[PDB]
Every structure is written in C-alpha cells, then in structure tokens.
Amino acid sequence: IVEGSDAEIGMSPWQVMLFRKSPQELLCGASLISDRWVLTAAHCLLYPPWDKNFTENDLLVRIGKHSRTRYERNIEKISMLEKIYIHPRYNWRENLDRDIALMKLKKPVAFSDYIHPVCLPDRETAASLLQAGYKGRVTGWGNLKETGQPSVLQVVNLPIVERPVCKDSTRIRITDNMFCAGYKPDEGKRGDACEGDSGGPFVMKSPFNNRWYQMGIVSWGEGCDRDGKYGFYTHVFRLKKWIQKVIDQFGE
C-alpha cells in the first residue's frame, strides 16, 4: 500500500497472507470468507508472463496477522491448501479479465478476535454501494513505494472512479468484471495498492446493516500511485456465480 497507514489491531480480521514456502516470502494478499475458503486473485497463482504457476503444496496461508515478517505466536494461524480453484474464463493472456480464485484450506481455521470472515455482496448491496465517489478500503503488506517494505499491515481508503475515467486512463481493455479506484490528480489526496497487495481485499462497510463487504480484489495497476493512473480490481459480485458453484460443488 502506497500512502496508507498502519492498520489497527483486528481492523481487518479477514486479511490473509499468501506465503511461499521456498523461499519463504510474501506471495500475495487474500481474504477469509468462511472457515475453509480463502479468496484471492487468479494471477497470484497463475500468470505465465511472469513464470508463475503454483500448486497446492508450494503455498501456505497465514491468517490473523498484523506484523509482516514476524511469526505471531498465539495469534496467527497457518493453514495448508487442499485445492486451488481458478476461474475457467480467467484471461491472463490479455487483460486479466476475471482475475479471481478460491483456495480450500485442509482444515477449518478457528475464528478469534484477529480472525473473522468478510461478507460477499449480494446484487442489492453491490448495486447501491459500487458507485463513483463511494470509498472502499484496501489493505496489505505490499510495497510502500513503486520503488519500501512495511512492518505492519497497511490500510488506505480509496474512492471508486467513474468507468469512463478508468478506461481513459489506460490502453488496456477494461471489462465489466473490473472497476478502478483511486484519487484523481487534482483531488489532492492519493494512495494506492502496490506489488505485494495483489490478491488482497477491497472492502466497503454497508451503511444499511453495518457489515463489511468485499467488493473487489486487487487485480492490476500500472506502477503504484501514479498521477492519472488507478488501481484496478476484480468485480466480486459479477463473479459470485462462479464462487457459488465452486463452494456449492466441491465445498465442504
């Protein structure tokens, strides 16, 4: 996260860290949506351009963390992956369309003050909250500058941008399965996700029932916090159908 601030303890109980076993390193951000399912970006697991194609055994899921590098004894819980599911129509060749994936943990994780699932939006919640100007929250242990490493989980609130503006800011083909967020150059304020935050959650707090909902997944961006550029996110609700099938199919 660029231009964010340290997260408060338990501020994001659903934040999940994708950790690479060998060598031990931060792989990506992700989210806890139930005691056995973790949501993240498809490219975090599969992305040929950068020679990336992880399998269950290469990954580890760390939940309930605050500190980035330290092993938080008696607080975080490390889970092993049982099966990874990547959207069948995930376009890693062109524009990362449908940049979403599910990971089934081998054993359910125990909820606590630092571990708690986030809600997946329904059509209505998405409809009324996913609007230009409405702010969302993005969190992660990713880089602080485009080019630097945080000690504590970072957080920043960012405004959703009008679709036209998003499209006019890049040469990449934008789809309805994507939305972009960030401050315009003249707005004064700034901030954005960055390398390492990818796969992480873009959440919003419903003013209707005071619950947190994950509307997006950190998908891609050109650089980090550049004037005129915006971070792009996977539109969770538009892909919820797939999420349902996976869970209501292989889901325990």
Binding site: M11, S112, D113, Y114, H116, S206, N210, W212
Partner: peptide
C-alpha cells in the same frame, strides 16, 4: 456466513476504527 463482516474488536463491541467514518461520509 451469518457472522460475516462483523469485527470482534469493533462492530461486535460497538467500537469504530479511526477511518471508517470517511467511508460512511462518502456514501
């Protein structure tokens, strides 16, 4: 999830975090 989106250290004990109001005000 029936309990989803309600944080143990915040919503569950009716404490708000330092910047969530920024979100509400944007709605």
């Amino acid at each position: 999830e029936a309990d989803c989106g309600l944080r143990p250290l915040f919503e569950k004990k009716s404490l708000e975090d330092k910047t969530e109001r920024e979100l509400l005000e944007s709605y």
